[PDB]
Amino acid sequence: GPYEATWESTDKHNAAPEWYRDAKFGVYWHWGAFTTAQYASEWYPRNMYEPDSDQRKHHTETYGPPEEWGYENFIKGAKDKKGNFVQFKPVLKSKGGEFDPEAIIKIVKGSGARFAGPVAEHHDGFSMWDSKVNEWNPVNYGPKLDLVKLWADLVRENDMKLVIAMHQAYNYNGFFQWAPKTNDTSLQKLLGQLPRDEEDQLWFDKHREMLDHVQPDIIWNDFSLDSPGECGSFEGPCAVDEQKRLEFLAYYFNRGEEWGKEVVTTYKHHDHGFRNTSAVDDWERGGPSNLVRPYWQTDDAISASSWSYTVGIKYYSSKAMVHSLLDRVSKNGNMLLNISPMANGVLPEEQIKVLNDIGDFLSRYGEAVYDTRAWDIYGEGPNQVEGGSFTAPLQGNSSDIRFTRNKEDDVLYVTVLGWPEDNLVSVKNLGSNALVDLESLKSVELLGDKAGDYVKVSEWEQSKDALDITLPSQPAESLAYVLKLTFDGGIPVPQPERGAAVFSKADATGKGVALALGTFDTVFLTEAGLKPEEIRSIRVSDGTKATLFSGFRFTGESKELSAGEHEVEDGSVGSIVVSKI
């Protein structure tokens, strides 16, 4: 194929194709031999060995000292301290068991997911397809099933794109640091104890074999691709050999071409292992606090605990999952939601309810979500994501709105995260302070009880503070409500309270992009719809300054502009920093 194992060659791959930007919502599942103990988290295989840990205590009391009853026993099977046989060994419903993958995929489809799939290999060294390069797999041991193939075939049968999650870098970069050393070369492969060159080759060989086996539309990667300092006390680079990363990218992108498919690979945002030229950044739980470009995604989980099922696990609400999805989508990302089947393969009813409720929202209000794109301002209101460390998912109310818009850029969806008791929705960024002319606002409609229903909104006034919209009779109850605002000739460009707006014509008219406080490089401005060479004017808000750079990313000649309107020379700007005075 055309791709070579170099950064320059693989940079040319289109990171986020249109189908992926259209998709918005997907589902995957942390289910595997790491679930067998149903204790603590999916990191149980690592922590069962940790000195003085609660997981080691539990393991020692339940199974045996981890030096005698090692993690491999969950895969190969062994009796616990009370004499019960323990093994990851799901039994198909068609064979009289409880594992019903077909039912689970129907539930996932019903949730409105447009991409779905398994964790194919976590950190624990267990490849869940029929693997020749890794004997530690569920065809050789346990259920005698190619779980990844089973899932993939069902995902395709149900008209969803296939995502496969792979976490096999941390396996040999410290996950198993507390496991006993072994001279058994098979056990070394499970526990990441092979020579590092062999481990680096195996990282690639696992990817290669898996992706040829099931032809994934998305390959999702966890950390330790190149994330120095992130592997705790283990002495090592917290990384995969650079050559092997490049060989993976070229191999996958070449197979995509061969298959006639636009494929995607993701990596953790903070990780340096891939580049945002050809791979999609995957943000930490909660996502970014702001609207980020280029297109990105984030993972989340129903569980209020672990990513893998544990006894006593608690869950978040349907409302929080839906409001979180809206928030991510408004900020120019997708949300990949993790679910957590029990070790026997059963999906708990609380999780099914959440998925049903998300699907009930998306089947009704999908117009405001699927196939849309971010506006230049993601939303308004008091309830926000802080970013950084996660605590609990976003839950908004009638005070909060999130924006999305259509591809034609003449329809703005205003989604309010609760029913206003005062029957009023006030959109600040469409008020007069926002310097917005509403002459072109042709209609305002409330989306109704079923998709394709619209209830006309008759009364609205534009104040200084906001477009003040009076709502009609409340439709059937839902977790959020959607207003559809149709303009002729395009949505107006708002002036942020503190911020700026750039324009393609010299007098603050034409195509434009609103900017918050922050840093906006050539990629940002281009994706937002105005290549910076085409900027010919800028309006800087009161209390704000803008610094223009000739360079792509805040280098080169610079110029500072205070509050007001300014003309810009064609081709003079590459990037912009917008700051509070």
Ligand X SMILES: *[C@@H]1O[C@H](CO)[C@@H](O[C@@H]2O[C@H](CO)[C@@H](O[C@@H]3O[C@H](CO)[C@@H](O)[C@H](O[C@H]4O[C@H](CO)[C@@H](O)[C@H](O)[C@@H]4O[C@H]4O[C@H](CO)[C@@H](O)[C@H](O)[C@@H]4O[C@H]4O[C@H](CO)[C@@H](O)[C@H](O)[C@@H]4O)[C@@H]3O)[C@H](O)[C@H]2NC(C)=O)[C@H](O)[C@H]1NC(C)=O
Ligand Y SMILES: *[C@@H]1O[C@H](CO)[C@@H](O[C@@H]2O[C@H](CO)[C@@H](O[C@@H]3O[C@H](CO[C@H]4O[C@H](CO)[C@@H](O)[C@H](O)[C@@H]4O)[C@@H](O)[C@H](O[C@H]4O[C@H](CO)[C@@H](O)[C@H](O)[C@@H]4O[C@H]4O[C@H](CO)[C@@H](O)[C@H](O)[C@@H]4O[C@H]4O[C@H](CO)[C@@H](O)[C@H](O)[C@@H]4O)[C@@H]3O)[C@H](O)[C@H]2NC(C)=O)[C@H](O)[C@H]1NC(C)=O
User: Which of 213, 261, 553, 566 touches ligand Y (CB under 6 A)?
Assistant: 553
In the bound complex, what is the minimum distance in angstroms from residue 223's beta carbon to ligand X? 12
397 binds, among ligand Y, ligand NAG, ligand X, none (CB under 5 to 8 A by kind): ligand NAG
Closest to 30 in 3D by CA, of 49, 43, 48:
43
DSSP states of 495-564 as a string?
--SSSEEEESSTTS-SSEEEE-SEEE-HHHHHHTT--GGG--EEEEPTTEEEEEESSTTS-S-EEEE-SE
By beta-carbon distance, which residue lies closest to ligand Y?
276
Residue 547 as a binder of ligand Y (CB under 6 A): the answer is: yes
- Based on CB atoms, which residue is closest to ligand X, 29 or 251? 251
Shortest distance, CB of residue 8 to ligand X, whole angstroms? 13
Binding of residue 14 to ligand NAG (CB under 6 A): no
Q: Of ligand NAG, ligand X, ligand Y, none, which one does residue 312 interact with (CB within 5 to 8 Å by kind)?
A: none
Q: How far is the CB of 272 from ligand X (least distance, A)?
A: 6
Q: Which DSSP category does 284 fall into?
A: P
Residue 456's contacts (CB-CB under 8 Å, 6 or more residues apart) are: 443, 444, 445, 446, 472
290 lies in the binding site for ligand Y (CB under 6 A): no
254 binds, among ligand NAG, Na ion, ligand Y, none (CB under 5 to 8 A by kind): none
Between 161 and 268, CB nearer to ligand X: 268
How far is the C-alpha of 406 from the C-alpha of 519, rounded, in Å? 25
Q: How far is residue 224 from each of residues 166, 168, 242, 276, measured CA to CA in Å?
A: 12, 9, 12, 16
- Angle at alpha carbon of residue 194, lines to 90 and 187, rounded to 5°: 40
Query: Which residue, 3 or 375, has its beta carbon nearer to Na ion?
Result: 3
555's contact among ligand Y, Na ion, ligand NAG, none, with CB below 5 to 8 A by partner kind, is: ligand Y
Q: Which is nearer to ligand Y, 161 or 269 (CB)?
A: 269
Neighbours of 146 (CB within 10 A): 19
The entry of Na ion, ligand X, ligand NAG, none that residue 277 binds, CB within 5 to 8 Å by partner kind: Na ion
- Residue 516 Cβ, how far from ligand Y at the closest point, in Å? 13
| Structural element, H or E, at residue 190 | helix 185-191
CA distance 170 to 232: 11
For residue 501, the minimal CB distance to ligand Y (Å) is 19
Residue type, 424: L
Residue 95 binding partner per list Na ion, ligand NAG, ligand X, none, with a CB distance cut-off of 5 to 8 Å that depends on partner kind: none
Cα 202 from chain centroid?
A: 26
Residue 158 touches which member of ligand Y, ligand X, ligand NAG, none, C-beta under 5-8 Å by kind: none
Binding site for ligand X (CB under 6 A): 226, 228, 242-243, 272
**Beta-carbon contacts of residue 3 (< 8 Å; ≥ 6 apart):** 9, 10, 12, 13, 249, 250, 253, 254, 257
Out of 554, 563, 565, 572, name the contact with ligand Y by CB under 6 A: 554
Nearer to ligand Y, 474 or 555 (CB): 555
Closer residue to ligand Y, CB minimum distance, 9 or 182: 9
Of 165 and 239, CB closest to ligand X: 239
Q: Which helix (H) or strand (E) holds 462?
A: strand 460-462
The interface with ligand NAG within residues 373-412 (CB under 6 A) comprises 382-383, 397-399
Q: Which does 363 bind (CB under 5 to 8 A by kind): ligand X, ligand Y, Na ion, none?
A: none
Q: How far is the CB of 264 from ligand Y (least distance, A)?
A: 16
- Name the β-bridge partners of 49: none
The Cβ of residue 581 has, within 10 Å, a number of other Cβ atoms equal to 10
From CA 90, how far away is CA 74, in angstroms rounded?
Answer: 12
From the list ligand NAG, ligand X, Na ion, none, which binds 433 (C-beta under 5 to 8 Å, kind-based)?
A: none
- Smallest distance, ligand NAG to C-beta of residue 181, A: 7
**Is position 528 an interface residue for ligand Y (rule: CB under 6 A)?**
no
Minimum Å gap between C-beta 19 and ligand X is: 32
> What type of residue is 399?
S
Binds ligand Y by CB under 6 A, chosen from 519, 526, 550, 572: 519
- Judged by beta carbon, residue 246 or residue 493, the one nearer ligand X is 246
d(CA 378, CA 499) in angstroms, rounded, equals 14
289 binds ligand Y (CB under 6 A): no
Q: How many CB atoms lie within 10 A of CB 169?
A: 29
C-alpha span between 256 and 27 (Å, rounded) = 22
The burial of 65, by beta-carbon neighbours within 10 Å (0-12 exposed, 13-18 middle, 19 or more buried), is given as: exposed
Q: Which option in ligand NAG, ligand Y, Na ion, none does residue 317 bind, with CB closer than 5 to 8 A by kind? A: none
7 binds ligand Y (CB under 6 A): no
Residue 72 vs 222, nearer CB to ligand X: 222
558 is an interface residue for ligand Y by CB under 6 A = yes
Residue 183 touches which of ligand NAG, Na ion, ligand X, none (Cβ within 5-8 Å per kind): ligand NAG
Q: What is the CA radius of gyration of the chain?
A: 26
SS3 417: coil
Q: Which of 52, 159, 183, 229 binds ligand NAG (CB under 6 A)?
A: 183
Number of Cβ within a 10 Å radius of residue 228:
12
Residue ranges in 63-130 assigned as alpha helix (H) = 72-76, 101-110
Question: Nearest distance from residue 404's CB to ligand NAG, in Å?
Answer: 21
Question: Which listed option, ligand Y, ligand NAG, Na ion, none, makes contact with residue 558 (CB within 5 to 8 Å by class)?
Answer: ligand Y
Find tokens 């030229």 and name the residue: 277
Question: Which spans of this chain sit near ligand Y (rule: CB under 6 A)?
Answer: 276, 292, 519, 547, 553-555, 558, 577
Question: Which spans of this chain sit near ligand NAG (rule: CB under 6 A)?
Answer: 183, 382-383, 397-399
